[PDB]
């Protein structure tokens, strides 16, 4: 089914599937544990929408439940991070976790914060478009866990969908007037950022393993934690 979608049908399907931007419970005194509780509470509520967003990504439902679980267990934090970086693009030097939760740079979380800020500045410098963002986010979902999958094993179906999204990114850049050289360079620049997003996610998992201390975590968030550890 996903193999029949044109480039515009691919974009429109991914745009229609976009989850909403949820709100934080931010108000008034703020302990470092209270600030983290707002972020983990927000991430938990976002996880429910991401799960239903994934089922709308073309090809994801064609997979086994076991592989759908595996792809989400590996990519859930990368997808939260690229969404945060996306909606923080128009706010230089600040991270927009929620519309009412705009955090500037001011224990160890400052390393993750600066890396997310640098990713947001890189997206802003490149003038990243929404149609490109939804493609990159769906690539992360399908690519982050494909290398960690017996012989029954059509994972070429994922690579077939991955190649379809790659054609979509090129179709987008060709519409923006970019030459063939500029299309290939921009495509490479976007995918190389996914390596840094993976790096931020791995460093985030190490911080999240340390938190599972006093700051409470939801049952779904703890299950996503046990996958990487």
């Amino acid at each position: 089914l996903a193999l029949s979608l044109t480039a515009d049908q691919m974009v429109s399907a991914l745009l229609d599937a976009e989850p909403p931007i949820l709100y934080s419970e931010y108000d008034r005194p703020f302990s470092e544990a209270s600030m983290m509780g707002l972020l983990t509470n927000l991430a938990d509520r976002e996880l429910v929408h991401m799960i239903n967003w994934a089922k709308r990504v073309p090809g994801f439902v064609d997979l086994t439940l076991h592989d759908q679980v595996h792809l989400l267990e590996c990519a859930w934090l990368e997808i939260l991070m690229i969404g945060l970086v996306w909606r923080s693009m128009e706010h230089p030097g600040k991270l927009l976790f929620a519309p009412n939760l705009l955090l500037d740079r001011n224990e160890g979380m400052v390393e993750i914060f600066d890396m997310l800020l640098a990713t947001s500045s890189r997206f802003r410098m490149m003038n990243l478009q929404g149609e490109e963002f939804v493609c990159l986010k769906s690539i992360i979902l399908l690519n982050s866990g494909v290398y960690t999958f017996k012989s029954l094993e059509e994972k070429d179906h994922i690579h077939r969908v991955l190649d379809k999204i790659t054609d979509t990114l090129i179709h987008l850049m060709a519409k923006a007037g970019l030459t063939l050289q500029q299309q290939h360079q921009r495509l490479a620049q976007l995918l190389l950022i996914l390596s840094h997003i993976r790096h931020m996610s791995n460093k985030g998992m190490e911080h999240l393993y340390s938190m599972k201390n006093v700051v409470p975590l939801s049952d779904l968030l703890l299950e996503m934690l046990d996958a990487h550890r």
Partner: peptide, 9 residues
Amino acid sequence: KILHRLLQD
């Protein structure tokens, strides 16, 4: 797990 039941819905 919760991720399995939420994908079932």
